[PDB]
A paper describes a structure:
Using this process, we identified a variant of NnhA containing three amino acid substitutions (T2I, G14D, and K73R) that exhibited a substantial increase in soluble protein production in E. coli compared to the WT when analyzed on an SDS-PAGE gel. We isolated and purified this variant protein (referred to as “soluble NnhA”) with a yield of 8 mg of protein per liter of E. coli culture and compared its catalytic activity with the WT protein. The purified protein for the soluble NnhA variant crystallized readily in conditions containing polymers, and data were collected using crystals grown in polyacrylic acid or PEG. A combination of single isomorphous replacement with anomalous scattering (SIRAS) using a single mercury derivative and multi-crystal averaging between data in the P1 and H32 space groups were used to solve the structure. With data close to 2 Å resolution (2.04 and 2.16 Å), the quality of the electron density maps was good and showed unambiguous density from residue R11 to R379 at the C-terminus. No additional electron density corresponding to metal ions or cofactors was seen, supporting the evidence by enzymatic studies that these are not required for activity. There is a single protomer in the H32 space group, but the same domain-swapped hexameric structure is formed when crystallographic symmetry is applied. While D262 exists in two rotomeric conformations in soluble NnhA, only one conformation with a slight displacement is seen in the structure of the C357A mutant of soluble NnhA. Hence, it is possible that D262 has mobility within the active site, which may play a role in the catalytic mechanism. The crystal structures from both space groups show that at least one protomer in every structure obtained in this study contained electron density for a water molecule within hydrogen bonding distance (2–3 Å) of H260, that would be also within 2–3 Å of C2 of the covalent intermediate.
Mycobacterium sp. JS330 produces 2-nitroimidazole nitrohydrolase (NnhA) that circumvents 2NI activation, conferring 2NI resistance by hydrolysing it to nitrite and imidazol-2-one (IM2O) instead. The initial characterization of NnhA indicated that, unlike most other known enzymes that degrade nitroaromatic compounds, NnhA is a hydrolase that functions without catalytic metal ions, molecular oxygen, or other cofactors. Despite low sequence similarity and limited occurrence in a few soil-dwelling mycobacteria and Actinomycetota, NnhA maintains the α/β propeller fold characteristic of GME superfamily enzymes and forms an unusual hexameric ring structure formed by a trimer of domain-swapped dimers. The residues in the active site of NnhA appear somewhat conserved in comparison to the ADI and DDAH, with the catalytic histidine, glutamic acid, and cysteine residues present in NnhA as H260, E197, and C357.
Residue numbers in the entry:
A (entry chain A), B (entry chain A): 11 to 379
C (entry chain A): 226 to 302
Write the structure that this text describes.
């Protein structure tokens, strides 16, 4: 449209003969996401809900992506092993990491999902040392209404990274920021949603109440839903992972949706209140294999492409059979090298756009018991 | 510093033999602004308070900066005149606007203040028409903790602009976003502060309670102060300006600090509660000339360079003499063309960095009555 | 808690409430248990033996703030 062709009718609040007060009031009342964020961006965006995923980003590793190449790791491996708590499976192999990355990318293209590639500078560092954990682009996933700057609870090598990814989203995709988390801890990217307006968090190394409150209030306002629910798990875990039990600081290792009102869930995730809530809201639970969970094969770290279809680690054989048994298609993908750090396949995907999908009301109305 | 020279001692929460829990807890407790925002930015930033201003940005106008060149203005001038409500002083003269802009910039350099220049694309438009009001870079002023995306109450031509300026701040200065205002209305840039932790807002076309609450909560957390106070004026005005009284939707037309515990204030600004509060907190009031105020010469739209020194419109002779009488140096600067839109000199300056300055306790302890 | 509070003979009464992840009595995948006495006990003044599967973040914070020293039970046991 031409610069001199604009007219007052292009302003949605304008009406012929409207008063100043009524125009201003219509403006105060407009929805931020649909009046400002999306039009200005010139597109929709956000990973909220359990609808159809259409657009993601990955990072292809270099030597600088590997945690064991940091001089701070070299100085004390046991310090970082205490923070993450994941079983030692020996050093990361760069070439194999790159291959499993190509395979994941192929899986996306074979399922009609656009993949962007995020690079970091050579010798990437923040004010406190080499970047660490920066392969895990879910930490920069995009919410309805915009990007979020996280407060990392346990990993100093992620300081500056959620900024970097948000900046990248703005410069490359034109997607704006929504909020910076400025108190306590909140890593929203590692959360999952189990319905259009149901978020799962944890209270953990990665989340305190203040951080959670800040995040939930911001994403609530732009979620596009009348209601917003936060299920808050309470795992027993000091750092990121408890290799004695399989409990994890992050929701996305403990639980995810695999279909409408159907969840894959860890043995170590559900306290009584959480269990009661899932029960009252008609969610059907598929239990992850306990050994797969405890040995950190990340069987719950599946990525939902759409209700009834997930990407999962190819070697989570037992959990995957149970998912198939629940009527869900599983796309097996190699994810071995990625687990050598604190995460699996879902953890490493930055989700950019997911179309609106089924709601909590849909879950509740499902007849299955 | 070299990429392989980093050690655990470069992590401020690290201590030899610290437990995972204690390390995580120290991390949850760290201050966002001083641990993350500023280190990652690699500088300090924020205009908060009444301390020494060091860094700003201006926009040098082109024909596309002029409000009367918009096809939507051409279609109905009376519609835009109802929104702003400012006295008609005839069309803007581009050449004169450019000259008064050079003069303002010279004033900054003569006072040791760095000036950045913001350009817009040719034929700048948003989803709803030509940009309008985009010369007013105070709307993009930077807060301690980061940039803000505003919700404009009355001007649709500012949609997309606060995003643009925030994006510019991030790409050019490395300053991150703090929050997007997503409900009601809040134009934080047009507010002023009268002490290190005292903000003045209005309830007006430009601000509702929900928007105000959202903004104040975000900037509170990063203000670097134990307390945060919001004085909320209640002007009687439908749009932006009331040419019968001098009342204005924006704090920065109604009031500003000129020194520690000394304010220049409009006749039309102070309701009883506001007056009581200023009185109880030991603020000395200098009244702006009523005619200067009502005729929209913007005598309160002075910019505080530091306690005891302001930039003011050169033709606000009466108000300026009173400011000098109160012991404050006035740097007179031509601001005629700028007033042909909804604003004056302070309105057009994006404030990027102001050093910490006097506090509310300092105001209260001043012996003057 | 209200009943035993009134007769405890103490000015204050505190209830630490663990939140184990367990459906029935015992979770043989983790060691989590419905009963406190399988999850934790005192062994001395301000010293506790505690299961890996017992302490959620709030419980952990509370024990920390109140100066309790924790001895971890062997995970396999
Ligand atoms: Na719970
Ligand atoms: Na008031
Ligand atoms: Na507890």
């Amino acid at each position: 449209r031409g610069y001199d062709d604009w007219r007052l009718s292009d302003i949605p609040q304008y009406k012929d003969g409207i008063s100043t007060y009524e125009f201003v009031r219509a403006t105060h009342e407009a929805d931020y996401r649909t009046h400002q964020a999306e039009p200005v961006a010139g597109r929709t965006f956000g990973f909220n809900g359990i609808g159809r995923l259409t657009e993601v980003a990955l990072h292809m590793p270099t030597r600088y992506t590997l945690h064991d190449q940091s001089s701070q790791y070299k100085e004390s491996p046991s310090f970082f092993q205490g923070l993450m708590g994941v079983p030692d499976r020996g050093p990361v192999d760069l070439a194999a990491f790159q291959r499993e990355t190509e395979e994941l990318a192929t899986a996306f293209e074979n399922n009609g999902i656009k993949v962007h590639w995020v690079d970091y500078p050579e010798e990437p560092a923040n004010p406190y040392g080499p970047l660490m954990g920066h392969v895990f682009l879910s930490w920069g996933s995009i919410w309805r209404g915009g990007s979020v700057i996280s407060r990392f609870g346990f990993l100093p090598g992620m300081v500056g990274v959620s900024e970097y990814l948000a900046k990248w989203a703005w410069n490359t995709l034109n997607i704006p920021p929504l909020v910076a988390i400025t108190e306590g801890a909140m890593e929203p990217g590692a959360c999952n949603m189990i319905a259009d307006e149901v978020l799962v968090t944890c209270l953990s190394a990665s989340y305190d109440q203040r951080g959670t409150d800040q995040l939930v209030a911001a994403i609530s306002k732009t979620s596009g839903t009348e209601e917003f629910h936060n299920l808050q798990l309470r795992p027993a875990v000091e750092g990121f992972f408890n290799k004695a039990t399989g409990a994890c600081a992050h929701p996305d290792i403990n639980i995810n949706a695999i279909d409408v009102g159907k969840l894959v869930v860890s043995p170590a995730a559900l306290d009584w209140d959480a269990r009661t809530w899932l029960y009252d809201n008609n969610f059907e639970l598929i239990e992850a294999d306990p050994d797969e969970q405890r040995e950190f094969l990340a069987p719950c770290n599946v990525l939902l492409l759409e209700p009834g279809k997930v990407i999962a680690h190819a070697d989570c054989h037992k959990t995957n059979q149970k998912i198939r048994d629940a009527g869900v298609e599983v796309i097996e993908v190699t994810g071995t090298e990625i687990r050598k750090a604190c995460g699996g396949i879902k953890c490493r995907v930055m989700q950019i756009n997911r179309e609106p999908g089924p709601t909590l009301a849909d879950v509740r109305n499902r007849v299955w018991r």
